[PDB]
Every structure is written in C-alpha cells, then in structure tokens.
Amino acid sequence: FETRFEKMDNLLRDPKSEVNSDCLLDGLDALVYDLDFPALRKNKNIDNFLSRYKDTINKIRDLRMKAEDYEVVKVIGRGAFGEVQLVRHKSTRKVYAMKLLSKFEMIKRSDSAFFWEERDIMAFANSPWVVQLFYAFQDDRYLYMVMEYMPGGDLVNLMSNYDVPEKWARFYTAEVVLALDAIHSMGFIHRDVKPDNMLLDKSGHLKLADFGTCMKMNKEGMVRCDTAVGTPDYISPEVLKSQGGDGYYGRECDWWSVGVFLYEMLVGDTPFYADSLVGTYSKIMNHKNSLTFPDDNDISKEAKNLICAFLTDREVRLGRNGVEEIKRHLFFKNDQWAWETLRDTVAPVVPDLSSDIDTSNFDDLEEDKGEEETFPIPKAFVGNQLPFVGFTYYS
Amino acid sequence: MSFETRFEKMDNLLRDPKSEVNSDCLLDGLDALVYDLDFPALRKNKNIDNFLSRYKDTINKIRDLRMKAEDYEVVKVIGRGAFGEVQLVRHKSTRKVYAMKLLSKFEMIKRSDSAFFWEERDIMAFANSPWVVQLFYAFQDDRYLYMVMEYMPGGDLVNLMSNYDVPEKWARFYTAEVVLALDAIHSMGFIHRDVKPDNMLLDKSGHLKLADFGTCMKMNKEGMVTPDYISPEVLKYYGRECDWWSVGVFLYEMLVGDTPFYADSLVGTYSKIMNHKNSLTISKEAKNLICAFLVEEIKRHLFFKNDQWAWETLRDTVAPVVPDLSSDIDTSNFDDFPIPKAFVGNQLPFVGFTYYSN
Numbered sequence: 078f079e080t081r082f083e084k085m086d087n088l089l090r091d092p093k094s095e096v097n098s099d100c101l102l103d104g105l106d107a108l109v110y111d112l113d114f115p116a117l118r119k120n121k122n123i124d125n126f127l128s129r130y131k132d133t134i135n136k137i138r139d140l141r142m143k144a145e146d147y148e149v150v151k152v153i154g155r156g157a158f159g160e161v162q163l164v165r166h167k168s169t170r171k172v173y174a175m176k177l178l179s180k181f182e183m184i185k186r187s188d189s190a191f192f193w194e195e196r197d198i199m200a201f202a203n204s205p206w207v208v209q210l211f212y213a214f215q216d217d218r219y220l221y222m223v224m225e226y227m228p229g230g231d232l233v234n235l236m237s238n239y240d241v242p243e244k245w246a247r248f249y250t251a252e253v254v255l256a257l258d259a260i261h262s263m264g265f266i267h268r269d270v271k272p273d274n275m276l277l278d279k280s281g282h283l284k285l286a287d288f289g290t291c292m293k294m295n296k297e298g299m300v301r302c303d304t305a306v307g308t309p310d311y312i313s314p315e316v317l318k319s320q321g322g323d324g325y326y327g328r329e330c331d332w333w334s335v336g337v338f339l340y341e342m343l344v345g346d347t348p349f350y351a352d353s354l355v356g357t358y359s360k361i362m363n364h365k366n367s368l369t370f371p372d373d374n375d376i377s378k379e380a381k382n383l384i385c386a387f388l389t390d391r392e393v394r395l396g397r398n399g400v401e402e403i404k405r406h407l408f409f410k411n412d413q414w415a416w417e418t419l420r421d422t423v424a425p426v427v428p429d430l431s432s433d434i435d436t437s438n439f440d441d442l443e444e445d446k447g448e449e450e451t452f453p454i455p456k457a458f459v460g461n462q463l464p465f466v467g468f469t470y471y472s
Numbered sequence: 473m474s475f476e477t478r479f480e481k482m483d484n485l486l487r488d489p490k491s492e493v494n495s496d497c498l499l500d501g502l503d504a505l506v507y508d509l510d511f512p513a514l515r516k517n518k519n520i521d522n523f524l525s526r527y528k529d530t531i532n533k534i535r536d537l538r539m540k541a542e543d544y545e546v547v548k549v550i551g552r553g554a555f556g557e558v559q560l561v562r563h564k565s566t567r568k569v570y571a572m573k574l575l576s577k578f579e580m581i582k583r584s585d586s587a588f589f590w591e592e593r594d595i596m597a598f599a600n601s602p603w604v605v606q607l608f609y610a611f612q613d614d615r616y617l618y619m620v621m622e623y624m625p626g627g628d629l630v631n632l633m634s635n636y637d638v639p640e641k642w643a644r645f646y647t648a649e650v651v652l653a654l655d656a657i658h659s660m661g662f663i664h665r666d667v668k669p670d671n672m673l674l675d676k677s678g679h680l681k682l683a684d685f686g687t688c689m690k691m692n693k694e695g696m697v698t699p700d701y702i703s704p705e706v707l708k709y710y711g712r713e714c715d716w717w718s719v720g721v722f723l724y725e726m727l728v729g730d731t732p733f734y735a736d737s738l739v740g741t742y743s744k745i746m747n748h749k750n751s752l753t754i755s756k757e758a759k760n761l762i763c764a765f766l767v768e769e770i771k772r773h774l775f776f777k778n779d780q781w782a783w784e785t786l787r788d789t790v791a792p793v794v795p796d797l798s799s800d801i802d803t804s805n806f807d808d809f810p811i812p813k814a815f816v817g818n819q820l821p822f823v824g825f826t827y828y829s830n
C-alpha cells in the first residue's frame with residue numbers, strides 16, 4: 078500500500094510522464110474516434126463502450142483546448158505536413174505561432190514519430206536558444222503546437238533583405254554555435270541546421286524553431302541511422318551517404334551545416350548549388366574539388382579558413398574535439414561581444430514592430446487550397462489515432 | 473466555458489470519484505487497450521504495434537503499482553454465485569479484513585451479461601448508509617472484476633432461520649430493518665427487484681445490511697421501472713411496490729418455515745405466484761401484514777407496534793442475535809479465453825470499474 082502509492086501519483090502529475098492526466102485522456106479520446114463507425118458498432122463490446130463514454134468524451138472535447146479557442150490572424154509558415162498560423166487565444170488575448178501537422182499525411186507517408194523529440198525539446202529545454210512550446214493539443218485531423226511568436230522572421234528573409242557584412246555574419250554564426258551546443262548538451266544531434274529554422278525574437282536574437290530531425294546520441298556521442306535526413310543544400314557527406322550498415326555518425330554533421338550557412342551568408346549562394354538536385358549530391362561528395370570561393374573577394378582570410386575547417390571530411394573537421402576549438406577560431410575574435418554575454422549585446426537587426434500581430438518580417442502565403450484529404454471509413458479496426466496518444470501538453 | 477473556468481470544470485471531472493473520466497477510469501482505458509491489442513495477428517498493424525512498443529512497458533509498471541489480487545491473503549471462501557465467489561481476505565500491507573467478491577469476465581462476455589455490476593458499484597460505494605454493505609475498493613485484471621467490501625461476520629438470514637426457531641419478536645425486528653433498508657434504496661432512486669434473506673447480512677452487532685444489488689434499476693422519469701420472492705408484475709412498467717411483495721414473502725417464510733408459493737417444480741411456483749388469490753394458505757396482525765403485501769403506511773401497521781424499539785432508533789437497540797466472535801477472521805456464521813484473429817475488445821465493458829475510496 079505505502080511501498081507503491083508514492084511512485085504512482087508522481088506518474089500522473091509529471092508533465093514529462095507518458096501516463097499523465099492529459100495523455101490518459103488522449104487514449105480514451107482516440108478510442109472513441111477509432112471505434113465510432115457503423116461496421117465496428119456491430120460488435121456488442123464496441124457499441125456498449127461507445128454508448129457509455131461517447132457523451133462524456135463530447136463534454137471533455139468541449140472543455141479541453143481546441144482550434145476554436147484560437148483566432149487565426151495570418152498564415153506565416155508552411156511545411157510538408159502542414160502550416161504555421163499567427164493566432165490569438167480568444168480568452169487570454171495572448172499571441173502565439175500555431176503549427177498544424179496533418180494526421181492523414183503522417184499515416185499515408187508512414188512518418189508519425191518525428192514530432193516526439195520536438196515536443197520534448199520545445200516544451201522542456203528552458204533555453205533562450207530554443208523556441209518555447211506552451212501547449213500541444215489535437216483533434217481527429219491535426220496535431221497542434223502553440224509556440225512563442227518570433228516577430229523578427231527567419232534568417233533566409235534577413236539574407237534576402239540585407240547585404241550581410243562579416244560583422245553581422247560573425248554574430249549569427251556565434252549564436253548558431255551556442256544554440257547547437259545547447260542541443261548537443263541535451264543529448265541530441267539536430268541534423269537539419271539551415272537558416273529557414275533560425276528565427277529572431279523582438280530584440281533580434283536567434284532561436285532554433287524546428288527539431289523534426291533531432292535524434293538522441295549514445296554515451297559515445299554517436300547515432301546509427303540508415304536513412305538520410307536534412308535539406309539537399311546543407312546535408313553533410315556522411316549523413317547523405319546513409320544506408321543500412323553505413324550510417325554511423327556524431328554531432329560534427331551539424332558543424333558542416335554551420336560552414337554551409339556561413340558561406341551562404343557571405344557569398345549569397347550555397348557552396349554546392351546546382352540546378353539539378355543530383356548535381357548538388359555530386360558536389361557535396363566531391364567537396365575536395367567542388368568548394369570554390371568567387372574571384373571578387375570581400376570575405377576575409379579567417380572567414381574562408383572557418384568555412385574550409387567545417388567543409389571537410391568528419392575526421393579532420395573543426396568541432397570533432399569539442400565546441401571550444403570552434404569558439405577559439407580567429408574568425409570569432411572581435412571587440413564588440415563575448416561568448417558568455419553574446420545574447421545580452423544589441424543584435425545587428427532589431428525588428429520595428431507596430432503591433433503584437435505585426436507580420437512584416439514574414440512573406441505572404443496562400444490560405445485556402447480548396448479541400449485537403451481525410452481517412453476513409455474503416456471496415457475493421459485500423460487505430461489511426463493510436464500513434465498520436467500522449468501528444469497533449471499544457472503545464 | 474471559458475479559460476480558466478473550463479480548466480476548473482475539467483480538473484473536477486478528473487478528481488470526482490463519481491465521474492466516468494476520473495484518473496482510475498482513464499487508466500482502465502489504457503490497460504484494456506494493451507490487453508485487447510497485444511496479440512501477434514493484431515501486431516501486424518503498424519499503428520497497433522508502435523502504440524504497444526510505446527506503452528506496454530509503462531502499463532506493466534502501472535499494473536504492479538495499482539491494487540491487485542496479490543495484495544490480499546485469502547483466508548476462506550465464504551460465498552458463491554453464478555459468475556464467481558466471495559473470499560474472506562486480509563490486505564497484506566494494512567492487515568485489514570474484508571470480503572472480496574470475484575466476477576468472471578469470461579462468463580460475463582459469454583452470457584452477454586456485463587452491466588449488472590454498475591448499479592451495485594454505485595450503490596455500495598456511494599450510499600453512505602448503515603443499511604448498505606460498503607464497497608472500499610473495486611479493481612480488475614484481464615480475468616476478473618474484484619470488489620473489496622466490508623465483512624459481515626453475523627452471516628445471512630437464511631443461516632439464522634436454519635439455526636433458530638424465529639419468534640414473532642425477532643421477525644418484527646428483521647422485517648422493520650428490511651423496510652428501512654429498502655426505503656434507503658428507494659430514496660436513492662432505485663428498485664431492488666431481488667429482496668431475499670440470502671442477500672440480508674448481519675454485522676458484528678447483529679444489525680441488518682443489504683449486500684447484493686445485481687438486479688437494481690434506476691426509477692425512470694419520476695419512478696416507474698430470483699424465484700420465489702418474485703412479484704406477479706415482474707413475473708409478467710411497474711413501481712417500487714414489487715419490493716414490498718418480497719418483504720411479505722420473507723415475513724411468511726420467517727414465521728412459517730417455508731415460502732408461501734413453494735413447489736417442488738419451479739414451474740409450479742410460477743403458477744402459485746400468479747394465482748396468489750387462491751394459493752396463499754401466528755398472530756392476527758402478522759397474517760394481516762403478509763396479506764397486505766400479497767412508506768409510512770407500512771410503518772403504521774399494528775404488527776410493528778411494540779414497546780421494545782422505535783423506527784428512528786431501531787439500529788441503536790440490541791439485536792436478537794449478537795455474533796460470538798473469537799477473532800477478526802471468525803467464519804463460524806458461514807457454511808463450507810480464445811486468441812483473437814481481429815479486434816474484439818473483450819475488456820471494453822469493464823473500463824471505468826476501478827474505484828479507490830480516499
């Protein structure tokens with residue numbers, strides 16, 4: 078009685094627990110969604126359970142957080158399985174960025190387990206380098222992620238609106254180095270470092286916003302993966318050549334991506350850019366001969382040295398012996414800021430905001446694409462809501 | 473509605489013991505899901521397989537932490553019914569003594585009789601009446617439903633009637649306790665439909681308590697909803713007066729020593745009940761009560777007129793038979809499945825049964 082009661086109550090209250098109150102309600106909610114079909118209702122056990130719980134689950138669906146609690150202001154982002162909307166909570170009047178992930182697309186593409194690491198990082202990181210997740214909820218169609226709004230926009234937008242000098246490039250590269258080191262300290266390899274995922278707050282400081290490819294390292298700081306992840310232009314040779322029996326790699330793959338980002342910032346183009354995606358694949362693998370700097374040079378000797386130190390083979394790449402050797406590079410030597418107080422110094426671009434719903438730093442996007450896709454009526458139990466049980470988070 | 477008053481209303485639903493979606497009921501849902509899905513044929517489905525790999529281990533931890541049959545030491549089997557048995561148990565940790573009823577899930581699924589325990593669970597757990605046997609805990613596994621109830625060491629009234637030549641003074645006491653016990657059930661909005669001495673138990677002081685509520689039904693809109701005690705209206709909507717018929721049968725049996733409509737063939741009993749006008753054959757007022765049954769008007773009857781006790785203080789007076797108990801485990805007053813090829817959900821009609829008082 079006493080030898081067990083303590084451990085059981087911890088499991089129900091703990092926000093990091095798989096069996097907390099919100100996760101247990103997901104189980105019952107998913108069960109009602111997956112069983113409520115006329116063909117399945119022919120079973121006495123399924124029919125009687127639904128007649129007993131369907132009405133009380135409808136009360137729960139109305140009481141719990143739902144999409145109707147939010148007022149959509151504008152679509153500010155788009156991805157493979159959904160979009161990001163600037164929302165305002167109708168009751169609290171608070172402004173957030175809400176990410177929607179299509180359950181249909183996830184089940185169809187057999188990609189329904191990527192969001193767990195993101196949910197854990199964004200909710201429990203408590204880092205000034207990570208975009209905060211306030212709430213996570215769901216319905217039969219979507220997963221919803223109520224995150225902090227980053228009004229400064231992304232670094233792709235900054236690079237397109239500004240001719241980035243080396244002093245600015247030094248600031249953003251150092252912020253990325255510190256942001257990635259925080260992720261490595263949490264026990265993760267990012268595997269998708271790109272300026273699209275790098276967002277700026279109201280003060281103009283950097284935060285990582287996407288963690289969909291994040292994977293936990295072992296005690297040796299390694300990961301075993303048979304499938305290449307990331308983006309065609311920023312992918313390192315070792316994660317690009319991933320396959321069964323040859324996909325063993327460490328955190329240094331994220332440092333390759335920093336070199337690609339630094340090159341892109343100073344040159345205006347990606348180092349391995351090719352009109353054909355396979356052309357880019359060839360260039361990354363042949364980095365020894367494909368990496369070239371343009372004849373008209375405005376970029377310093379130490380800036381080129383950093384790009385080349387990151388854009389090599391993993392065994393000779395900067396970062397292999399820790400983050401300190403990256404910090405000690407001559408490119409980062411300046412009299413404007415210090416590594417330990419960098420996020421306290423004034424950013425190169427500070428956003429000029431007129432309201433709490435100002436989206437001037439975000440490009441315009443389409444809202445209605447007609448109608449999407451839904452799951453067909455099951456003839457037997459399929460359990461399409463089961464991989465999403467335990468996603469709900471509030472705290 | 474709205475934030476955060478709907479959050480208060482949601483947190484109430486999770487804590488309330490009478491709620492269908494409290495913490496223990498929600499754990500039953502996940503527990504049932506793991507039991508009903510963990511089969512190799514069902515595991516061929518990617519959604520079923522991945523959910524099980526994600527929750528099976530944590531559900532095993534929960535099964536070990538939550539109340540289970542192993543927490544109780546079985547002393548003796550003291551009762552038996554259609555779908556199970558009643559065991560005298562002792563909780564290994566608290567050392568407390570209870571009566572544990574076991575109900576077979578296999579039999580409940582097979583006979584399409586898996587809803588009778590809900591009214592009993594609600595009555596026994598939330599009655600808070602000295603006339604109703606208390607339910608302290610309700611738990612379950614893949615095979616049984618378990619009901620940890622208060623032990624009634626005095627035994628049942630069938631055992632009392634077989635061990636004693638019951639005088640009218642004793643009959644007056646037990647009939648009045650049944651009248652008060654049934655009125656408490658009617659006040660809760662229920663109709664018993666199985667009033668028999670087998671379901672009438674006595675505590676350590678010798679006072680009556682109703683122990684079985686397997687045939688109880690909630691009184692429709694305002695109030696309009698097993699042999700030989702069965703009434704002609706039930707034997708083929710009716711009211712609570714069908715329970716008063718059974719009191720008359722019980723009073724007759726106590727004073728005569730046989731049931732009024734007794735027959736060697738069960739079919740013969742059925743006919744006798746319907747033909748009660750001609751089939752019904754030592755005080756005048758005792759006979760008048762039996763015939764009146766064959767509320768305040770019951771209490772006002774001349775049979776209950778005595779100088780020993782009063783209706784409002786009856787359970788405080790000394791009982792006719794007080795149990796002589798030697799220990800806390802004294803039982804002297806007591807005599808002595810297929811693997812699914814597809815989802816069937818055999819654990820679903822038992823989701824929400826778990827209850828822990830305090």
Ligand SMILES: Cc1c(C(=O)NCc2cccc(C(=O)Nc3nc4c(s3)CN(C)CC4)c2)nnn1-c1nonc1N
Nearest residue numbers: 154155156157158159160161174191224226227286289
């Ligand atoms: C605009 C914006 C953003 C954004 O634009 N995020 C990108 C974004 C938006 C909407 C949906 C998705 C998406 O489908 N992702 C997937 N990943 C993976 C998928 S499918 C399958 N498999 C390949 C593995 C990884 C991505 N994120 N935050 N944010 C914000 N703007 O202001 N404040 C913010 N937090």
Ligand SMILES: Cc1c(C(=O)NCc2cccc(C(=O)Nc3nc4c(s3)CN(C)CC4)c2)nnn1-c1nonc1N
Nearest residue numbers: 551552553554555556557558571588621623624683686
């Ligand atoms: C011995 C004892 C007792 C007892 O003897 N109870 C009788 C008893 C014991 C074990 C199982 C069952 C049972 O299966 N019932 C069903 N009902 C129904 C069923 S299946 C299907 N449908 C037709 C509706 C009604 C009944 N009840 N309490 N108790 C106690 N003794 O001490 N303290 C106690 N609480």
